[PDB]
Amino acid sequence: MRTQVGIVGAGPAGLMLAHLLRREGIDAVVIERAAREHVRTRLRAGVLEQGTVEMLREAGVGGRIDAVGMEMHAIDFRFGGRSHRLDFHEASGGRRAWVYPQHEVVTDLMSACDAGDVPILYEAPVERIEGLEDDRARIVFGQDGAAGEITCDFVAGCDGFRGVSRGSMPAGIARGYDRIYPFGWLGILADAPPASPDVTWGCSDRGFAMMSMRSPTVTRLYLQCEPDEDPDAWSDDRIWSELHRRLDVEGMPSLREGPIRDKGVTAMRSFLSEPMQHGRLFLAGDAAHIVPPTGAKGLNSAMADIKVLAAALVDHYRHGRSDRLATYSERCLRRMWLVQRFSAALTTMVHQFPGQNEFVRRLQRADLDYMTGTHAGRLQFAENFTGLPIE
Amino acid sequence: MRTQVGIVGAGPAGLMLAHLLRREGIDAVVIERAAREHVRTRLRAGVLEQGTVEMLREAGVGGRIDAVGMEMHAIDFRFGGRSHRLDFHEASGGRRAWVYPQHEVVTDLMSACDAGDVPILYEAPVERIEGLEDDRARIVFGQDGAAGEITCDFVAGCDGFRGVSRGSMPAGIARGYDRIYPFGWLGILADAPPASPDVTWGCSDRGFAMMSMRSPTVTRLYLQCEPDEDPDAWSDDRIWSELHRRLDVEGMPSLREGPIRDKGVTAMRSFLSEPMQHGRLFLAGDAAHIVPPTGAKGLNSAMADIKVLAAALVDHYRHGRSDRLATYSERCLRRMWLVQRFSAALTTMVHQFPGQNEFVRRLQRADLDYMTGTHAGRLQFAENFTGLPIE
Ligand SMILES: Cc1cc2nc3c(=O)[nH]c(=O)nc-3n(C[C@H](O)[C@H](O)[C@H](O)COP(=O)(O)OP(=O)(O)OC[C@H]3O[C@@H](n4cnc5c(N)ncnc54)[C@H](O)[C@@H]3O)c2cc1C
Ligand SMILES: Cc1cc2nc3c(=O)[nH]c(=O)nc-3n(C[C@H](O)[C@H](O)[C@H](O)COP(=O)(O)OP(=O)(O)OC[C@H]3O[C@@H](n4cnc5c(N)ncnc54)[C@H](O)[C@@H]3O)c2cc1C
Ligand SMILES: [Ca+2]
């Protein structure tokens, strides 16, 4: 009930922070609203930036990703009826990404926290965060009709976009930047080995599509769809038909069809909240900012926030310096606004906007041509996709 | 009344083509709707790409660029209260730009067309163009209720955005891409020395402003204004006061004030029409495409179209090959869509859009931070501003 850092949310951001604080001897308690089996079994794809992989390695939780993490070097941007394999490994001078599912990361982080005796309260939704300028902050929650409270020097808000920590900021201090895109992603799993080994984007004018490897025998496929789209309106035949039209090009093998599983719709939205700290409250991850998943930046941005947050807390407790805590939001926001810039730039380029001005629509092809066909375009994509530096 | 290439419009595009075809022994006739002095002094500003400068020198009309012109190595992007000098000379690996106004270019091309006996009919608006799919094309012009006619092998549509050649293509051929921006430019000429040795862009949240330098004595200044702004609503002191607010930064010399001579409101519009040819008609310059002047691309695009058109025509009359004429629209539209992309990107970054989504508006600063603060950002701006390859 008394700790140094109270961590709201046992997602990737919260578990990584608790793991980093434990190895530094800083005490922390994680409070999660969902059941432990629900957090682990929440499946989601995962493209990790190199900085994220190095962060997991150096924290002693990179053994499994170094064992089976699939190194990723290129994206096949398909448009104009042709392939455009952008080798961002070459274009970034040796930096790359790793295909490693997010549910594997949390499983690795949950194992590290469990092995480290990190207290994690599950099925205990936080109801209030108070005392942000008091001697100690108070995390009010309830487990099963019984209310609880964690007292802590600092509250790390790692409770995601729909958590409570962002709303716990003072109203006169918080400011939001919100943009919802007029489309969603229809995601499926296909029981068929992928056609090509590269992550493949269909960026033609019939709509956005994406093809990636979920496993050696399962393909992950996305289709741009209406924002409020019912997955029942998409039969298997319609899905494969639209997937063929948006992805197939001459000179490349046709799409591998198979039984479709796990049909779902995900939203597309850019949101950022300022500041990311006030008093004893520090926001990180989706609690402070979300991006359209086009650039695979959300989890990597969360890990970047935690990297800065963990170091600042170590400087406070271990070295008696509070200036790094005071610059947490400042440094995280600089990187995150460039991440927001990159995720939006990809989203507005590869998706079809209903009723969009025809000149702006044609600029999408012009942006695709320049990004893939010029050294400057390939350079900017490579450095952003593999991960911007962390301050 | 009979020539080889009938040129519609005596702007920089039409004059440059008439001179180039004359240097190679090809006969041409220019038909201008306005007076001679009106065309010469229509626009008293302009920045030239390096490729445009070399083209003028190799054509024999670029001897005055060293004296009258102003060579550029950097632009001072001012925002957030600070200067950000982007040295596009170093970033592009040696390429640069020149401040050489359009009224100086036209005077040079008028001299060459005069010194080479190029027939130019002024105050004779072209009314109709026919025979594009016949063995010979006809240009029907008029003057005081008097119809004239000019027969030619090919028609060069260089009559600008308000011209008639773009509408001369058969029904269903032409397709237009049009996007208007919700602001205009209030441009002035001032008898005041430049406050800094570099062309300065004011990317303020009050609106865009620019300080260009005609000479060490005169300054060219632009202000973002309402699209149909009444220049009468902008007194001298209001202009200087707003220019101070959008340009002055601490630590840099303040803007100098002086007598204001030129003053006018110009629109901000992106337009491009496809194709740039049909049979014996060939469009060049503003007749086929206009951009917002944010990136100094209109004239340079017109000179890029003429360089391809003059080469294809010389290849036709000298070697009997129409292969380059058949690919004129193909190659010109390839470069122009990248030029449209760069002109739109700068325009949507540096101007304030009323009622804009807050996230998108804040991305303007993110785009400004990346363009000036990263090697990848500077490289892309440098190569684009100094001029893309023409091919
Ligand atoms: C389809 C898709 C694909 C993606 N692909 C990628 C990719 O390739 N690469 C990448 O880097 N990112 C990717 N992302 C983004 C990434 O998944 C998210 O950014 C990431 O989940 C953020 O983690 P987080 O810990 O900050 O938030 P979350 O993962 O949402 O964790 C928040 C946790 O807090 C808990 N919680 C909520 N409210 C409370 C409360 N009141 N009290 C207590 N606990 C609470 C939640 O139950 C949850 O466990 C993708 C996202 C989507 C949707
Ligand atoms: C404020 C401003 C700043 C600019 N700055 C730059 C810059 O820095 N760099 C740059 O490269 N560009 C710049 N531009 C763009 C540049 O001025 C134009 O793109 C350029 O004038 C295009 O040349 P053109 O010959 O194709 O068209 P025009 O210059 O418009 O020539 C067309 C000619 O045809 C004539 N004509 C029209 N209709 C007919 C008809 N029916 N019959 C006969 N004749 C006809 C017109 O009278 C005119 O003389 C700027 C433009 C503006 C408005
Ligand atoms: Ca108290």
Author numbering:
A (entry chain A), B (entry chain B): 1 to 391
Pull verbatim passages from the article behind this deposition.
Para-hydroxybenzoate hydroxylase (PHBH) is a group A flavoprotein monooxygenase that hydroxylates p-hydroxybenzoate to protocatechuate (PCA). Among proteins in this clade, Xylophilus ampelinus PobA (XaPobA) preferred PCA as a substrate and is the first known natural PCA 5-hydroxylase (PCAH). The overall structure of XaPobA comprised a homodimer, with each unit binding an oxidized form of FAD in its active site. The XaPobA monomer consisted of FAD-(amino acids 1–73, 88–198, and 267–391)- and substrate (amino acids 74–87 and 199–266)- binding domains.
